[PDB]
Every structure is written in C-alpha cells, then in structure tokens.
C-alpha cells in the first residue's frame, strides 16, 4: 500500500463530508476520539522497564525531508516519549474532544474556523511532549500564539483585543529569553537533544546564566509572581476552549519544561538558586490568593486559583526529592481535570444563559439550578484540595518535599490549604446561597452534554485521588533521574 493513498482517502472523505454537510465538528470529534484510542494503544505497547525513549521518529532530515530518516547523520527534529511525556499526552487527548464539545452549540459565526483552531492548538500541544530537542520544543512552544491570538480576537468577549495582545506579548517576551539560553546551549554543546544532554557538564558560571533565561520564560508561562497579570485577563476574555486548553495544558508545559530542560542540565544552578525560586513561588501563592478575595468577575477567580496551584507545584518539583516530582506532576494532572470543569461552569453555562460574569447578579442557583449547585460544590472542594482528589495528593506531596528542602518556606506555604478555601468558598457560598436573584430569570438546568463533561473530569480526579499509585508505572524512573544528591 501507499501511505499517500491512505491519507488521500482521509482527505477525500473530509472533503465530501465538508461539501454535503457544511460542517467539520463531527469529523474532528471522530479524529479526536481516534487519537485517544491510538495513544492508548501506544500505552499498551509501552515498556515501563526502560528509561530510554521509545517510538522515536525523526523529521525533516536532509535526505528524506517529507518522510522519516533512517540515516547515520541526524540533523533534523527529533521525537519520542518517556513515561513523563506519555502522562500529559493522555491528559491532552482526554481533554481535546471535551474542549470541542463544550462549544458544540454556542458558536454560530465562522464555526469551522473555530474548530480548526482548537484542534490545531491541541495537536501542537500534544506534539510538544514528544519533542526530544530544544529547537523542536521551542517551535512548538511558540506555535500556539498566532492561533490563540486569532481565536481570542474573533470569538472573544468584550475586551478580547487587549487579551489577545497580552497573551502574545507576554509569552513572546519570556520565550525570547528562552531562545537566548537555547542558542547559547547550541553554540556551546553544538547539539540539542533530550537524550544525552545531562552528560555534558558545563561550567557553573555558565549554568548561572543559562538558568536565568530559562527561568524568565517559565515565570511568564507558569505564571509566577510578579508576571502573573496576563493570566486573569486572557482567561476572562477568551472563548471556553481557549480557557480550558490554557489552564489544562499550556500551564503544564512550563512544568514539563523545567523537568526536561532545566533539571537534567543546569543541576548545580538549580541547587544554588532554589531559594530564590521558593521566594517567588511563595509570593505567588499568598498574594494571588489574597488578590482573589477581592475580585468581582467569576472567571478571573478561577484563573487566580490556577496560579496558586502551579506555584505549589513549583515548590515540589524544585525541591530535589522524589515525592516532590510525583506530587508536582499529579498536581498538573488533577489541575487539568478540575480547572476546565470550573471554566466550563462559569464560561459555558452561566455566561451562555445570562451573558454576564459579575458575582453581584448571581445568587440562589440552588433553587432552580440544583444540579449545577452540586457540581459547583464538588469541584470547589476538589479545587481547594479535599482528600480523595488529586489536587490534595499533589498538594501534600509537594509540601512534603518543599518542607524537606527548606522547612520554613515549606511550612509557611501550608497556608495555601487555607487561602484556597477562602477565595473559593466565599464564592461558592454566594452562588449556592440565598434567595434567587431578582436580576436573573430562570433557565434550564444543566444539559446532558455538560453533565457528561463534568462527570468525566470528576471521575478522573477521584480515581487518582483514591489510587494515585497507578501513575507510578510511568514515573518511577522520572522521580529519580532528576535528583542531584551525592
């Protein structure tokens, strides 16, 4: 057979479906469920007894550009997975169909452009985890900006324009200093690959410099104090898939970037500059939580919580301990289950019904919208880290390791257990509480589409909250590769 004939069959079927029924979302949903299954098959065929990278394929080689390279000289972009990358891959295929299905009926102008852009962002994120060299990572790290800008500017809310320039300029700023560090790596080592980059022991004085450019970027993407001011706006004015994709995956890229670029190399700079990281993560936690206590827009509040949980996860991964790695990862997974549910509730339910996000209108949903109340409270108690939910198991483990590295900072950061409860329950009480708002008339309870989504995002986090050990089969190497202890 011909590879070209199979994809020509697919493209032909896609053209006919586009021409008969003038819509794509059925084909994209099919492709999304197909990718999920194919990734599951890769997990079936993935050996957990090997720290090596599997399913390697190289692209854009000199000899066979539009195919795959079997050469003895590799000058192209590399790809392949370890168990770390497979974890977030499973998170991304799991979310993409839901990010399309959270917008199945509310997009009515230029719909096919929207579902194209969503799938392109989701596929680009997926391939970023397969990346095995600094340059392929970077060119798939920066490829979401044009699509996010376009998506937000067209299908956004009132203040879409300001949000779109913010997601672009901030992320581009941090990315460019990442490019400088990568370029210094590339003119020194003369090789960029995530296979043998830990062997090369650069001088300390140069690790102290490369680290600054990598960390400037990761401050801007994660985000972290004091570059935490783009996230609330970009979430507030984005379409629902933009918010779900962002909070679920793009903020997890910063964590994958640390583990894959910054720790196996630059070890000595990590163990020297870790206390400055603890300063920054701690300020991120408390100040963003307290800033959340006095906000008015619903979607902005969920956004601030995302900054806090990422800042806890940075305490753990940057702690030089196994439990820190396994917690910071599980935070990223459970966060990418919980936060999309909340952004769905506050961005594709309430905003669809009443077209406003101010808390002052909302009150007394429990009377006419009870099922929405039940989901709000469950997700609120999972967000804050009620046990038997991954957002606790990850909080606890990261605070174990943060306490080990610096006990004072790792214990003064335990107040996140409180402050998360404050800024989330002050809101949940308002929504589920009181007499029905006079400003709001009645509308339907949650429909089955949204109930499907929230029940998936809750079953997944309850599972990893009940038996987190399932994820260890992929990560038992990764908890020890990135530990610099003599």
């Amino acid at each position: 057979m011909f590879l070209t004939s199979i994809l020509l069959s697919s493209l032909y079927l896609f053209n006919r479906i586009l021409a008969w029924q003038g819509n794509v979302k059925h084909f994209y949903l099919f492709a999304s469920n197909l990718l999920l299954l194919f990734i599951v098959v890769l997990y079936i065929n993935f050996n957990t007894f090997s720290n090596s990278f599997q399913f390697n394929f190289e692209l854009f080689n000199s000899l066979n550009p539009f195919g795959l390279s079997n050469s003895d000289i590799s000058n192209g972009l590399l790809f392949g997975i370890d168990g770390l990358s497979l974890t977030f891959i499973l998170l991304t295929v799991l979310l993409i169909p839901l990010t399309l299905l959270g917008n199945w009926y509310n997009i009515n102008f230029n719909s096919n452009l929207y579902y194209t852009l969503v799938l392109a962002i989701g596929l680009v994120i997926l391939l970023n985890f397969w990346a095995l060299d600094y340059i392929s990572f970077y060119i798939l790290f920066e490829a979401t900006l044009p699509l996010l800008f376009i998506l937000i500017h067209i299908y956004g809310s009132s203040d879409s324009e300001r949000a779109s320039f913010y997601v672009l300029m901030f992320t581009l700023s941090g990315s460019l200093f990442m490019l400088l560090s990568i370029v210094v790596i590339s003119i020194v080592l003369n090789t960029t690959n995530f296979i043998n980059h830990n062997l090369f022991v650069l001088s300390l004085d140069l690790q102290t410099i490369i680290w600054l450019g990598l960390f400037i970027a990761i401050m801007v993407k994660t985000p972290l104090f004091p570059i935490h001011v783009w996230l609330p706006v970009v979430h507030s004015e984005s379409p629902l898939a933009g918010s779900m994709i962002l909070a679920g995956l793009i903020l997890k890229l910063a964590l994958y970037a640390i583990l894959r670029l910054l720790l196996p190399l630059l070890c000595e700079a990590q163990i020297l500059y870790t206390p400055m990281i603890y300063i920054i993560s701690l300020l991120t936690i408390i100040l963003t939580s307290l800033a959340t206590l006095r906000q008015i827009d619903l979607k902005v509040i969920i956004a601030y919580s995302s900054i806090s949980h990422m800042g806890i996860a940075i305490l753990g991964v940057c702690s030089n301990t196994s439990l820190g790695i396994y917690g910071s990862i599980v935070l990223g997974v459970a966060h990418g289950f919980v936060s999309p549910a909340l952004f769905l509730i506050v961005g594709g339910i309430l905003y669809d019904r009443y077209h406003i996000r101010i808390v002052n209108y909302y009150k007394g949903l429990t009377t006419y919208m009870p099922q929405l109340a039940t989901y709000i409270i469950i997700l609120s108690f999972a967000n804050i880290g009620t046990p038997l939910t991954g957002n606790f198991t990850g909080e606890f483990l990261s605070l174990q390791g943060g306490f080990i590295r610096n006990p004072i900072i790792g214990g003064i950061s335990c107040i996140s257990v409180l402050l998360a409860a404050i800024y989330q329950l002050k809101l949940t009480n308002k929504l589920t509480g009181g007499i029905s708002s006079i400003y709001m008339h009645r509308t339907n309870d949650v429909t089955i589409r949204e109930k499907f989504i929230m029940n998936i995002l809750i079953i997944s986090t309850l599972i990893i909250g009940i038996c987190p050990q399932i994820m260890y089969n992929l990560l038992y190497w990764t908890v020890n590769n990135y530990i610099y202890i003599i």
Binding site: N45, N47, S52, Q54, E58, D72, L78, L189, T191, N196
Partner: protein, 69 residues
Amino acid sequence: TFFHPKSREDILNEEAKIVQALNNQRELTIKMHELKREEKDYAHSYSPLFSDPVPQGGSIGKAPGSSRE
C-alpha cells in the same frame, strides 16, 4: 497477554543508534566550523590561473633596476 512491548535490548540499541548519529552531526558541525575560518590559498581565494600575486607594472618605460624581491 496483549502487552507486546519492544524488549529492553532493542530499545537501548535504537536509542544508541540515534545518539551516535547525533554525535556524528556534532563532529561534522565542529569540523566545518573549523574548516571555514581556516586560512586558504591565494588561488582558492582570488585567482586560480594567475596565482602569482606579485604585481608587474607598466612597460612603456621599464627601468632596469625597478624589480625587487
């Protein structure tokens, strides 16, 4: 039973082959960075044919005593 992964040994050999080719590209890159910015010959740089740089001047009043080395 449906778990049919590639063995540890074949995986390690494949990763080794990849790393070997990457190191080959590294050495080629360094060797070319050195081959460039290495001094060349005059013929390769200016004139293959008239490779004698030495300038012979005019001829209308060629004075014996004007050549020098």
